[PDB]
Design a protein around this ligand. Structure first.
Ligand SMILES: Nc1ccn([C@H]2CC[C@@H](COP(=O)(O)OP(=O)(O)O)O2)c(=O)n1
Ligand SMILES: [Ca+2]
Ligand SMILES: [Mg+2]
Length: 341
DNA sequence: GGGGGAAGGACTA
DNA sequence: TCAGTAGTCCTTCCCCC
């Protein structure tokens, strides 16, 4: 099995550079402005010029401006990025029937029935990069290996504007030398749990009792890591089907007043239904982020589709439930629809 | 023990 | 006043065979 992973380079920022070439060469930072106050919000992404200075996705916009006050700060235009992405995804579809769109700027292609070996896989990779560059003027990084996990790892090692093949011998080397924290699906929390078990490399998961590992990180992740370490991981590339659609916004001020929160909630529902387009959900969840940034949610699944009117009435009840069961003030409020018919 | 379902978590983008 | 937004899958917990 041969998997080819495509990962668009610093995507949002790159799209803004393509739409406005005068920005090339300068540090560009795409931001999510919350509106609570001047420059409140976080960085969605930044081009590599800005990253050289430590500006990365996730950091407060103010922190970024303290480090790079003269960079170009742009508001995120998600709709634009989505349209460019869909066009690029359509180009990828021409190279394989078996394609998994993981997110807005990542996709896995099973090309095992398209190429004879990694030599040809590498060439298809170059062809894919050239096609996207030709059509959309966007650079991407390609990762190639025996399965989805190592194809992605390859892309991580090669970005930006790269192409990397991780052959069978290198997979074995990585199983023994790659820090387990760099394996997809292993975040800080899980990495620390593993640390306590003396596990820092995939190979280490083969020196401990499965029972002990499963007790620390759960059966799902335990079987996952072991299959990888044993080099048996071969999960198929599956066509992605949207399971949920939602919208969450930050309020001007923290609140516990139902009438003050409702407008934000209804606005989120309107935007959610716009995005649903044709899809009809059977489940609705109201999600709230409290003043201390904890996340609380209350939902309901109906035996039928949810009309926009039902969404309005039910969302109010779910919100009242949240206010009745949690005493903290709310900072962000939103909704998420799922279980489509 | 575990199927189901709701809600809390962890993780990726 | 540092603390966004979108989406997926697994765990925890409780009711109840
Ligand atoms: N914490 C995050 C992280 C990523 N993102 C989004 C933004 C863009 C999209 C692609 O990100 P990039 O191509 O810049 O990531 P890269 O490949 O590591 O350079 O993922 C977001 O909104 N918040
Ligand atoms: Ca990317
Ligand atoms: Mg990690």
């Amino acid at each position: 099995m041969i998997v080819l992973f495509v990962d668009f380079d610093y995507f949002y920022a790159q799209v803004e550079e393509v739409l406005n070439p005068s920005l090339k060469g300068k540090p560009v930072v795409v931001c999510v402005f919350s509106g609570r106050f001047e420059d409140s919000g976080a960085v969605a992404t930044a081009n590599y010029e800005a990253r050289k200075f430590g500006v990365k996705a996730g950091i407060p916009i103010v922190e970024a401006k303290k480090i790079l006050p003269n960079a170009v700060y742009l508001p995120m235009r998600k709709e634009v990025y989505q349209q460019v992405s869909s066009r690029i995804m359509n180009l990828l579809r021409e190279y394989s029937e078996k394609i998994e769109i993981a997110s807005i700027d990542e996709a896995y292609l099973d090309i095992s029935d398209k190429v004879r070996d990694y030599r040809e896989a590498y060439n298809l990779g170059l062809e894919i990069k050239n096609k996207i560059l030709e059509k959309e003027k966007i650079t991407v990084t390609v990762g190639i290996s025996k399965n989805k996990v190592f194809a992605k790892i390859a892309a991580d090692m090669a970005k930006p504007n790269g192409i990397k093949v991780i052959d069978d011998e290198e997979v074995k080397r990585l199983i023994r030398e790659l820090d387990i924290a760099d394996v997809p699906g292993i975040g800080n929390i899980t990495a620390e749990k593993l640390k306590k078990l003396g596990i820092n490399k995939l190979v280490d998961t083969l020196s401990i009792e499965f029972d002990k590992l499963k007790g620390m990180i759960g059966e799902a992740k335990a079987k996952y890591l072991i299959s990888l370490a044993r080099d048996e991981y071969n999960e198929p590339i599956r066509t992605r089907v949207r399971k949920s659609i939602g919208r969450i916004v930050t309020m001007k001020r923290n609140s516990r007043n139902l009438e003050e929160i409702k407008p934000y909630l209804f606005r989120a529902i309107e935007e959610s239904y716009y995005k649903l387009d044709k899809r009809i959900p059977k489940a609705i969840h109201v999600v709230a982020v409290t003043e201390d940034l904890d996340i609380v949610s209350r939902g309901r699944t109906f035996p039928h589709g949810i009309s926009k009117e039902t969404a309005y009435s039910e969302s109010v009840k779910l919100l009242q439930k949240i206010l009745e069961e949690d005493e903290r003030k709310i900072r962000r409020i939103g909704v998420r629809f799922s279980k489509f018919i």
